[PDB]
Amino acid sequence: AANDNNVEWNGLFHDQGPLFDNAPEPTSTQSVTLKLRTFKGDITSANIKYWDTADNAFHWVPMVWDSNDPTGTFDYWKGTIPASPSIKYYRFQINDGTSTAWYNGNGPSSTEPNADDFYIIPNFKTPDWLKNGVMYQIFPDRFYNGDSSNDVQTGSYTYNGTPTEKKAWGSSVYADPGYDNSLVFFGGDLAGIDQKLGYIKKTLGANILYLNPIFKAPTNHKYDTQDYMAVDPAFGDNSTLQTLINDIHSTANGPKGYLILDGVFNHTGDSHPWFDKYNNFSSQGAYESQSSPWYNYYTFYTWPDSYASFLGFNSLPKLNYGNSGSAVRGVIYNNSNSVAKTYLNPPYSVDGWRLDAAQYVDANGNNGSDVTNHQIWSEFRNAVKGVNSNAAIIGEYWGNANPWTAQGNQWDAATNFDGFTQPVSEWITGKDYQNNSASISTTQFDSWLRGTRANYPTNVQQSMMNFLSNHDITRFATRSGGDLWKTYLALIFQMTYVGTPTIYYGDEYGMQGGADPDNRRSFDWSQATPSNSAVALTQKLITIRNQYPALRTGSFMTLITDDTNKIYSYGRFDNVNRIAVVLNNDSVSHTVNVPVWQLSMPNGSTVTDKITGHSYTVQNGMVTVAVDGHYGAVLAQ
Ligand SMILES: C[C@H]1O[C@H](O[C@H]2[C@H](O)[C@@H](O)[C@@H](O)O[C@@H]2CO)[C@H](O)[C@@H](O)[C@@H]1N[C@H]1C=C(CO)[C@@H](O[C@H]2O[C@H](CO)[C@@H](O[C@@H]3O[C@H](CO)[C@@H](O)[C@H](O)[C@H]3O)[C@H](O)[C@H]2O)[C@H](O)[C@H]1O
Numbered sequence: 001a002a003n004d005n006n007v008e009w010n011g012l013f014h015d016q017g018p019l020f021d022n023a024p025e026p027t028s029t030q031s032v033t034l035k036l037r038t039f040k041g042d043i044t045s046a047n048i049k050y051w052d053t054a055d056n057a058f059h060w061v062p063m064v065w066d067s068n069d070p071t072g073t074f075d076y077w078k079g080t081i082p083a084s085p086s087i088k089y090y091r092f093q094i095n096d097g098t099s100t101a102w103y104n105g106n107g108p109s110s111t112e113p114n115a116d117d118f119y120i121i122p123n124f125k126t127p128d129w130l131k132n133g134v135m136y137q138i139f140p141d142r143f144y145n146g147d148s149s150n151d152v153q154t155g156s157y158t159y160n161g162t163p164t165e166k167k168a169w170g171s172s173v174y175a176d177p178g179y180d181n182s183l184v185f186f187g188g189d190l191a192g193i194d195q196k197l198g199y200i201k202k203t204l205g206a207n208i209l210y211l212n213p214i215f216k217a218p219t220n221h222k223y224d225t226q227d228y229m230a231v232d233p234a235f236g237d238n239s240t241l242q243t244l245i246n247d248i249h250s251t252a253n254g255p256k257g258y259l260i261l262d263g264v265f266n267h268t269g270d271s272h273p274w275f276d277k278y279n280n281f282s283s284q285g286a287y288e289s290q291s292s293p294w295y296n297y298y299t300f301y302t303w304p305d306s307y308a309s310f311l312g313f314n315s316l317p318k319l320n321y322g323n324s325g326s327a328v329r330g331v332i333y334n335n336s337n338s339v340a341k342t343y344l345n346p347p348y349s350v351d352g353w354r355l356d357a358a359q360y361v362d363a364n365g366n367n368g369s370d371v372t373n374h375q376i377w378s379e380f381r382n383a384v385k386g387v388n389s390n391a392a393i394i395g396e397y398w399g400n401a402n403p404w405t406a407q408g409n410q411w412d413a414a415t416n417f418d419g420f421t422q423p424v425s426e427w428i429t430g431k432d433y434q435n436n437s438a439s440i441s442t443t444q445f446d447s448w449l450r451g452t453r454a455n456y457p458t459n460v461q462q463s464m465m466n467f468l469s470n471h472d473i474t475r476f477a478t479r480s481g482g483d484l485w486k487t488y489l490a491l492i493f494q495m496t497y498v499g500t501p502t503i504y505y506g507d508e509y510g511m512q513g514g515a516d517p518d519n520r521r522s523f524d525w526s527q528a529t530p531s532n533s534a535v536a537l538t539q540k541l542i543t544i545r546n547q548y549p550a551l552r553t554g555s556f557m558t559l560i561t562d563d564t565n566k567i568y569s570y571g572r573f574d575n576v577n578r579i580a581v582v583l584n585n586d587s588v589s590h591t592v593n594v595p596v597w598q599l600s601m602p603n604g605s606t607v608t609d610k611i612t613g614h615s616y617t618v619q620n621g622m623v624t625v626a627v628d629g630h631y632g633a634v635l636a637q
């Protein structure tokens with residue numbers, strides 16, 4: 001507002017959105033010009049302080065006033081960080097006489113921060129389609145039986161002494177007395193996925209599909225791989241995969257699509273020939289003979305009964321990656337005919353992988369989260385991106401996955417449990433994703449989101465897998481107590497936040513379910529139509545996100561965090577649009593004066609709540625909109 005020995009925090013802003021960063025994914029030779037925003041005439045000077053990993057030192061770049069925003073309310077200060085190959089971390093020092101403030105990935109600060117700085121990873125690139133798409137996850141057996149001839153039947157076969165049980169579509173997922181939950185089948189398959197492709201890409205609008213394991217394995221989840229080179233017979237054959245991939249990539253049935261596979265590379269099933277615990281193959285596996293040609297693919301403490309595994313499960317023997325150039329690293333990703341490259345190269349050309357239990361991948365039976373583990377995911381990236389630079393790499397991780405993403409040498413993104421799923425669950429349903437009592441206020445929710453968003457490079461943020469539920473946690477509908485309205489707010493949010501909106505099959509209509517395996521129920525297709533309130537909004541929302549780049553790659557600015565009325569409003573914006581999102585997490589209606597001036601929405605200009613179609617006019621920097629309890633508006637211009 002003026003030069004008064006006071007830096008006004010409310011006027012301050014910056015992130016790597018279009019208005020502030022002219023190069024968010026630069027090469028070794030591209031300069032990064034940054035723009036800081038402040039209330040007009042509020043400061044005396046500003047500077048950029050960045051740490052360059054090339055010489056391990058802090059560098060200084062004084063900023064200069066660049067311009068005013070259309071409403072003459074803000075000042076934009078600029079500075080440029082020189083182009084080089086090295087990773088850089090920056091923050092801002094803001095001065096107004098005797099007052100000094102700092103700003104970085106975590107927003108304003110009275111004292112100088114030492115963490116949460118903004119990133120500059122030269123030559124690091126996350127595929128843009130992932131950044132701008134909407135994903136739909138499918139647990140094969142439970143989506144749609146499109147071919148009843150490949151169905152696993154009761155007794156069809158046995159695993160570790162247990163016969164398989166077949167369920168009627170819609171029945172409980174729990175095994176009946178005498179059977180195992182891992183050996184319960186409903187019939188979902190690849191042909192089913194292909195036949196319902198119209199529901200995916202059109203009825204909903206999603207353009208990205210992510211499949212849980214689909215390779216030869218005895219269980220129903222299939223994380224106990226028996227053969228990476230073959231599609232499990234129950235889901236079809238490799239030929240079926242090809243037709244599906246072609247039908248997904250096809251733009252003759254809707255938006256061009258991308259397929260992402262589940263890569264279970266940390267371990268193998270105990271029935272995989274390399275191990276062959278039950279001797280299902282003539283060859284000799286590691287378990288049967290210390291002279292086995294694959295003996296060293298695993299780690300034994302006391303051969304053959306005690307060996308390394310995934311969290312103690314004997315059915316999932318841990319793979320030993322050894323050192324660079326090892327046979328294992330070759331069969332998984334180095335060899336041209338490896339698991340990762342085989343499916344990434346024709347005649348399959350899938351578009352990416354979901355790294356299951358990626359934090360554990362290691363050598364000699366160790367648990368990862370160490371140097372070797374990271375060295376491995378670095379070679380993995382060179383192998384993948386070497387075959388196709390636009391093939392996505394998303395690792396599974398429940399906490400801060402900064403160690404595997406913050407240097408642009410490993411994954412493109414990660415399963416956003418901590419930055420999306422948990423905060424959303426606790427804010428809307430008052431439970432954590434495992435359905436335990438855990439509630440947070442709007443203020444707390446907005447902070448939680450900013451802190452976790454700051455853990456990652458901007459392009460990683462835009463590529464994070466944001467789901468309300470997934471195959472390992474309780475369903476949102478159950479955590480909601482059945483209140484379909486909470487699902488409405490959740491959807492509206494999910495489709496307007498930073499990151500790849502990811503729909504866990506069934507969530508779009510309000511499916512319920514507890515802990516594994518009850519969170520993997522068969523899909524109720526009578527509810528899969530626009531006649532369902534939730535399904536309709538999902539589609540409405542998806543259409544809206546695809547309409548505005550500002551929602552996929554724009555900036556994010558908090559506008560309202562009211563704990564009294566439980567209202568949360570934020571804005572997504574770029575060079576073309578300004579979107580004010582208003583959310584009501586209360587159980588009663590509220591009239592909100594949305595301060596759209598913060599997004600520089602001109603007075604007299606009109607805005608439209610793309611959810612209702614109702615138009616509004618910006619007067620005195622505000623927009624008054626009434627919103628029902630557990631719902632929201634999407635004011636766009
Ligand atoms: C399931 C999940 O467990 C870990 O995740 C931790 C996480 O790291 C922690 O930070 C914290 O948040 O807690 C979670 C767990 O809630 C692990 O790190 C993850 O990698 C793992 N998820 C992936 C890996 C698994 C192995 O490939 C997959 O699970 C499959 O295999 C499991 C083991 O048999 C099956 O688990 C069943 O669990 C029930 C318990 O209700 C048991 O009774 C039953 O015997 C088990 O079979 C599961 O059904 C399979 O899907 C998982 O799907 C991957 O996503």
Ligand SMILES: OC[C@H]1O[C@H](O[C@H]2[C@H](O)[C@@H](O)[C@@H](O[C@H]3[C@H](O)[C@@H](O)[C@@H](O[C@H]4[C@H](O)[C@@H](O)[C@@H](O)O[C@@H]4CO)O[C@@H]3CO)O[C@@H]2CO)[C@H](O)[C@@H](O)[C@@H]1O
Binds near residue numbers: 051056115116117406
């Ligand atoms: O889970 C891993 C950790 O991830 C997060 O740490 C991030 C920070 O949030 C980022 O801001 C950034 O930090 C840079 C920092 O910006 C830069 O100035 C420089 O900082 C130190 C340097 O590390 C240290 O060796 C010494 O030289 O002093 C410098 C300044 O005094 O380097 C930092 C990182 O190299 O990156 C880190 C990690 O990528 C999160 O905040 C942590 O909680 C988490 O543990």
Ligand SMILES: C[C@H]1O[C@H](O[C@H]2[C@H](O)[C@@H](O)[C@@H](O)O[C@@H]2CO)[C@H](O)[C@@H](O)[C@@H]1N[C@@H]1C=C(CO)[C@@H](O)[C@H](O)[C@H]1O
Binds near residue numbers: 449451452
């Ligand atoms: C910012 C912070 O938000 C979340 O933390 C939650 C806690 O989980 C909850 O128990 C309670 O304390 O409220 C907090 C909200 O502030 C999130 O779970 C954290 O991960 C996140 N923590 C920062 C980000 C990183 C990711 O974990 C950490 O590495 C870092 O040290 C934190 O500053």
Ligand SMILES: C[C@H]1O[C@H](O[C@H]2[C@H](O)[C@@H](O)[C@@H](O)O[C@@H]2CO)[C@H](O)[C@@H](O)[C@@H]1N[C@H]1C=C(CO)[C@@H](O)[C@H](O)[C@H]1O
Binds near residue numbers: 040042067
């Ligand atoms: C340098 C000056 O730039 C900005 O001023 C511009 C206005 O915003 C425009 O509307 C138009 O009038 O052009 C002006 C440029 O001449 C900015 O708003 C100012 O705050 C800024 N001046 C600050 C910096 C100085 C250097 O320390 C101080 O002397 C001065 O008091 C500050 O206000």
Ligand SMILES: OC[C@H]1O[C@H](O[C@H]2[C@H](O)[C@@H](O)[C@@H](O)O[C@@H]2CO)[C@H](O)[C@@H](O)[C@@H]1O
Binds near residue numbers: 485586588589590629
């Ligand atoms: O009745 C269903 C409806 O209830 C709520 O609406 C509130 C309204 O917002 C309050 O201001 C007041 O009028 O009571 C109404 C009902 O008691 C919810 O806001 C909404 O979710 C729900 O559909």
Ligand SMILES: [Ca+2]
Binds near residue numbers: 041043
């Ligand atoms: Ca001032």
Ligand SMILES: [Ca+2]
Binds near residue numbers: 145150
């Ligand atoms: Ca079938």
Ligand SMILES: [Ca+2]
Binds near residue numbers: 279
């Ligand atoms: Ca054998």
